[PDB]
Structures are given as structure tokens and as C-alpha cells.
Design a protein around this ligand. Structure first.
Ligand SMILES: Nc1ncnc2c1ncn2[C@@H]1O[C@H](COS(=O)(=O)NC(=O)CCCCCCCCCCOc2ccccc2)[C@@H](O)[C@H]1O
Ligand SMILES: [Cl-]
Ligand SMILES: [Cl-]
Length: 625
């Protein structure tokens, strides 16, 4: 699978069904450690829970068989389990049964129980997989829903291993849906991306090829298995030939040094380590994860690549991360900005293995007008842009003017459209939205197209992201739906947030949200302020800028103006827009998505409801102070 590659013939992927492969892999390395769960739920210093490939293989076959009895073909099997070893057994066990898996989370964890109801409504699974300790909690949750199709709850650790003897190899085609990856799609109703048996292995090869993963290397992770980056990482790490070590996201947030520690060289280890994380985590680890004087020596010279993706990369957070860990051997080539999305299984691009991150600066006015014009770092009105690198093999990413379905030249910002075998096939039960998102014809190409190699009649998937190529690197400008359009002009919310943050110490880094709202709904307090601009008018529906930013840690007083004036002035000058309401709230209050990204839509929804000014929560595993 990996050197130390027969699936890449003449620069193209070739090599299906994972169950088949997982089983061979399991028997060959039986009695070797497959997974190690570092459990920090009871002991702060942690407890190691291990499972060998043979045991893992056996458990998957037991669960698969139990499912093959209590479910019908076509049924969905949802996993409502905390992050631990039974989660993997539940997920793999579901794949082993041949039914469509739906990896989710334990209703007993905080943050998004509301999403869980929506997903269950959408895919109506006949069976829920969980652990014995979470079972009562899961049954309570399920009982509270409609009696009609009330699904069976199965505790996987209670299923005897010998049941595996009645397991029958499921038969699967390459186009068969293996599982559903739920994402908060175009509407309130979540979308379940159909990931097939061909999508998985293709994207694994795409990733391992880009990282030059070799036998002897190993993966480490704290990412949630209910998110694409966390789940796919399990599979990537599993094929490196060394055990995969993981922890829960909450354990990372509480003490990020636990992750840093697992990334370190083990005694006598010659291979390298890989991991992945969202931007905010580099900031957190840089500040909270440096080892004290007491701790045993820490060596990070073995770290090959920590992929940084899922949200815009802050050059300052990366800088602070490199600087905090450089003394321990962390190479400048070890942090790798990358791009991906659920619809592509996971991975689309990453920085080439041998190079450091590419960070450039572009003129703001040109950027907002959909063009990359490079400018010096200290140039006024400059916007930092971090490259997402080069597109994976046997995969294409083109920049398109959606209106006419035409490719755009380099430097021009358009929507990013993708084509490749790693691209999902649709959204569960959504025929029309699936057609609109996944079955698009690229009508016009520029000569020397980025579609070179794709068939003329190749189908393209619309990502919903704006982006461009610049000096052969793919840049992710931002998410189309998150744009702040005011007075007929676009603004990237992360750009406005950066400016707000940079103007005043009263805001904590990475916790700001910029969104537009019709002048109708903004509070009365805004009109009673000389620093406002507009005045009372119930007819006016024009979009107006609002900025919400968590108060820097240790904030106990309210001295709004001096901070707000700096923010409004900083944004007026550099963006040509007047911030109307600057709302600063309790540390750890701004809404976070389930993977820990800032929830802008949710911050806008709660701003209007008055649900945000007030709030001693809402608990999330990502909360800190
Ligand atoms: N670099 C970026 N900059 C700005 N925005 C980015 C972004 N990446 C994603 N996004 C934004 O997030 C959206 C997608 O969101 S999502 O559906 O929730 N999915 C996501 O966010 C998924 C992002 C995935 C990024 C690539 C990560 C590859 C990690 C491989 C590890 O390798 C290993 C590890 C261990 C052992 C061996 C190998 C995208 O549509 C875009 O708007
Ligand atoms: Cl047993
Ligand atoms: Cl080794």
C-alpha cells in the first residue's frame, strides 16, 4: 500500500470493498497493536486502552453478524457512541454488516443534540450502536422521539465475540454507499454525504501519496470521529503499519500538551508521525501545550506532517506554533496547510512535502473584487492569504464562474469545482439538490486548464467555496454563503474579523464573528450613538455589518466605546464599511460548530434572538478561558 506503491499506474490511481482489505490487513498483522485509546476521563495523567488487530477483526465480525440478523438490507445503522474503541468497532462493525453506517455522537455530550434529532429524522436508522455505559442515556434519548419507528439500541461491548462465526461477508460494488457523512448543508435540514466503497480507498491513496507516508510512520489524533477529518484520519493512520493513537477532543482542549506529547518521538522509533488539526488548535497548543521544566525531554524532530485545515489558516497562529515548538525539534516543513470537505471524502490539497507554508499578501480592494493582486506584507490595506498547496493525484480542482460554468484564469476568484473518484455521489434522500451540487458540466475551459486530464464530459461537484490559483498554488478565499455583502460589495468575514482583532487587545484571538443583518432588526442602542451613521427606519432592509467578539480572558468590566471606536475606525478606514453594532460577550460563549469552527450563521441567528448577549454557556467540548 505504502513504500518503505502498486495502486498508482502511470501517475493515475487504479487498485473494491474495504471489509475485504481490513480483514486481510488484520490477519497479516494479527497480535500487533491496532489502536490505542488514551482515556483521560478519570485520571488526568491518562489510561491506555489497547486492542490488537486479531481482537479488532473478531469484534467487527461479531457486531457485523448481530446486525445482519436484526436489520434488513438498505437500513441505516447510526453510531451514537462517545469517542473510544467501541466507536471504531461500531463503525467498522456496521461496514462489516453491509448496511449503511451513519457515524454520529453520544446524545450525552454537549453542544449539538439538536443536530442529532435532525440527522435521525433525515436518515431514520433502524438500529443504533453505542456502548454499555452510554446505553441508558441513548435509550432515554430515543424514547423521547416518536414511538413509530423506534430503532433498536445495541451495546457493542455486550455482543459476544463468538457471534462472529455466523458473520457473512457482505458483497459490495465500488458505487455502493458505505456510509453517510452528515454536514450542515445548504439549509437547516442537514445533508448526509454518500461516501462509497470507491471514495474511501481512493482518498486514502490520494492522501498517503501527497504525504509520502511510509511503512514505519504513525498517526496521532484527537479529532472527533463524527467529523470527516477525524474519521478519515482513523483509516489513514491504520494503513501506515503502526498502531493509531487517539484521544477525545475534550482531552485535547483541557490539556493540549497531551497531543504534543503523543506526536513526540518514542524511544528507538525511526519513522515519522502525522496528525491533522483545525487552525484554532495550533493557537491553543502554542499557548497551552509547551512542556514545563519538570517534564521528560520532548523531541518533535520526528513529526513529518501536521495538516492544518478545515478553516482559514492564520499565519500568526502558525508562527506562534512554530516558535513555541521549534526548540523541541519541530521542523518548519511539519505544518501543512490543506483543504478539503465532506463531499470529497476528505482531502483535496496540501502543501508539497518538502516545503514550508506559502503565505502572501494581496490588496483588499482587488480581493473583494474577485482578484488576487499581490502586495508587500507591511503594505496598507493588505490581506494575508495562506496557500492550501497542490491538488491530490487523480483529482482535479478548477476555478469557475458558476453563472456560465466557465473556467477562470489564474488570479481570478471563482467557485471551486471538483472532479475525482473521491467525490461523493450525493446527499441522502435529496435528488434535486444532489443533481445541482454533484452533476455539473464544465462548459468552458481556459487553454492550459486545471481540468487537464479530466474527461470533457466529466461531472463536477460544486464546493460552495471561492478560491483561485496563484503561482501554481490553490488558495481558498472563503465560503460563498458566509460572505458579507453590503451596498453591493463583498467582504470576507475572516478579513473583517482579523481587522477587528488586530485593533484592540480586548478581543481574544480567533473568537470573532462578522455577519450582515437587515437594518430593520439591529438593536435600539445603536441609534443612540453618534458613532453609528444610519438612523431609525422600519422600511430599510439594507444589509448592515455587525461584529461579535468574545471578550479577552479575564474581562470583568464594561468599557465598550474605547474598544468599539477602535474597531469601527479600524474597519471604516480599511474596509469602507461602518460596523453598526459591536457586541462583545463572555469568554467561551460565541457559538462553535461541532468540529469547533466559529458558527457565524448561529452567531447571527442568536444575535437577533437576544440569545447571545445573555448566556452562561453553551457548553461545548471546545470551551476554555
Ligand atoms: N485550508 C482551508 N482554508 C479555508 N477554509 C477551509 C480550508 N479547509 C477547509 N475549509 C472549509 O471547510 C469546508 C469543509 O468543511 S467540512 O465538510 O466540515 N470538512 C472539512 O473541514 C475537512 C477539511 C479537511 C482538510 C484536509 C485534512 C487532511 C488530513 C489528512 C490527515 O493525514 C494523516 C493523518 C494521520 C495519519 C496518516 C495521514 C470547506 O468547504 C471550506 O469552506
Ligand atoms: Cl468475549
Ligand atoms: Cl520504526
Amino acid at each position: 500500500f505504502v513504500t518503505g506503491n502498486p495502486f498508482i499506474v502511470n501517475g493515475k490511481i487504479r487498485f473494491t470493498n474495504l471489509v475485504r482489505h481490513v480483514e486481510k490487513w488484520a490477519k497479516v498483522r494479527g497480535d500487533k497493536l491496532a489502536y490505542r485509546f488514551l482515556d483521560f476521563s478519570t485520571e488526568r495523567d491518562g489510561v491506555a486502552r489497547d486492542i490488537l488487530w486479531s481482537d479488532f477483526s473478531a469484534r467487527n465480525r461479531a457486531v457485523g453478524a448481530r446486525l445482519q440478523q436484526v436489520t434488513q438490507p438498505g437500513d441505516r445503522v447510526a453510531i451514537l457512541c462517545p469517542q473510544n474503541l467501541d466507536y471504531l468497532i461500531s463503525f467498522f462493525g456496521a461496514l462489516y454488516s453491509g448496511r449503511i453506517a451513519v457515524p454520529l455522537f453520544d446524545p450525552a455530550e454537549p453542544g449539538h443534540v439538536g443536530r442529532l434529532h435532525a440527522v435521525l429524522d433525515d436518515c431514520a436508522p433502524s438500529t443504533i450502536l453505542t456502548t454499555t455505559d452510554s446505553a441508558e442515556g441513548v435509550r432515554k434519548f430515543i424514547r423521547a422521539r416518536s414511538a413509530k419507528e423506534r430503532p433498536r439500541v445495541i451495546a457493542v461491548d455486550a455482543v459476544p465475540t463468538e457471534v462472529a462465526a455466523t458473520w457473512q461477508q457482505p458483497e459490495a460494488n465500488e458505487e455502493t454507499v458505505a456510509y453517510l457523512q452528515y454536514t450542515s448543508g445548504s439549509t437547516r435540514i442537514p445533508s448526509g454525504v454518500q461516501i462509497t466503497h470507491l471514495n474511501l480507498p481512493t482518498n486514502v491513496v490520494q492522501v498517503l501519496n501527497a504525504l509520502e507516508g511510509q511503512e514505519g510512520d504513525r498517526g496521532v489524533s484527537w479529532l472527533p470521529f463524527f467529523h470527516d477529518m477525524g474519521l478519515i484520519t482513523v483509516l489513514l493512520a491504520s494503513v501506515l503499519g503502526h498502531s493509531f493513537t487517539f484521544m477525545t477532543p475534550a482531552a485535547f482542549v483541557r490539556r493540549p500538551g497531551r497531543w504534543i506529547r503523543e506526536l513526540a518521538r518514542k524511544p528507538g522509533e525511526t519513522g515519522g508521525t502525522f496528525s491533522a488539526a483545525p487552525n484554532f488548535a495550533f493557537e491553543h497548543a502554542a499557548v497551552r501545550g509547551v512542556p514545563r521544566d519538570d517534564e521528560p525531554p520532548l523531541d518533535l524532530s520526528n513529526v513529518k506532517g501536521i495538516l492544518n485545515g478545515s478553516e482559514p489558516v492564520s499565519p500568526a497562529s502558525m508562527r506562534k506554533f512554530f516558535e513555541a515548538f521549534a526548540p523541541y525539534g519541530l521542523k518548519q516543513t511539519a505544518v501543512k496547510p490543506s483543504y478539503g470537505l465532506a463531499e470529497a471524502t476528505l482531502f483535496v490539497s496540501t502543501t508539497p512535502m518538502d516545503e514550508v507554508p506559502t503565505v502572501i499578501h494581496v490588496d483588499r480592494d482587488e480581493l473583494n473584487n474577485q482578484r488576487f493582486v499581490e502586495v508587500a506584507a507591511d503594505a496598507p490595506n493588505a490581506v494575508a492569504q495562506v496557500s492550501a498547496g497542490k491538488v491530490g493525484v487523480s483529482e482535479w480542482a478548477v476555478i469557475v464562474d458558476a453563472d456560465t460554468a466557465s473556467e477562470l484564469p489564474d488570479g481570478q476568484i471563482g467557485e471551486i469545482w471538483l472532479h475525482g473518484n473521491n467525490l461523493g455521489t450525493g446527499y441522502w434522500g435529496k435528488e434535486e439538490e444532489s443533481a445541482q451540487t454533484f452533476k455539473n458540466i464544465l462548459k468552458s475551459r481556459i487553454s492550459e486548464s486545471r481540468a487537464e486530464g479530466a474527461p470533457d464530459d466529466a461531472l463536477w461537484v460544486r464546493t460552495g467555496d471561492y478560491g483561485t490559483y496563484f503561482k501554481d498554488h490553490l488558495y481558498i478565499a472563503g465560503r460563498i454563503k458566509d460572505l458579507v455583502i453590503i451596498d453591493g460589495r463583498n467582504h470576507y468575514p475572516q478579513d473583517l474579523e482579523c481587522t477587528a482583532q488586530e485593533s484592540t487587545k480586548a478581543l481574544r484571538v480567533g473568537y470573532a464573528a462578522a455577519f450582515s443583518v437587515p437594518a430593520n432588526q439591529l438593536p435600539q442602542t445603536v441609534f443612540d450613538d453618534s458613532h453609528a451613521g444610519l438612523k431609525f427606519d422600519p422600511e430599510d432592509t439594507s444589509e448592515q455589518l455587525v461584529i461579535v467578539g468574545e471578550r479577552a480572558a479575564g474581562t470583568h468590566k464594561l468599557d465598550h466605546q474605547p474598544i468599539v471606536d477602535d474597531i469601527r475606525a479600524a474597519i471604516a478606514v480599511g474596509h469602507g464599511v461602518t460596523v453598526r453594532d459591536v457586541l462583545l460577550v463572555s469568554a467561551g460563549t460565541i457559538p462553535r460548530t461541532s468540529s469547533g469552527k466559529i458558527g457565524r450563521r448561529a452567531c447571527r441567528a442568536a444575535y437577533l434572538d437576544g440569545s447571545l448577549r445573555s448566556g452562561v454557556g453553551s457548553p461545548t467540548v471546545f470551551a476554555t478561558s
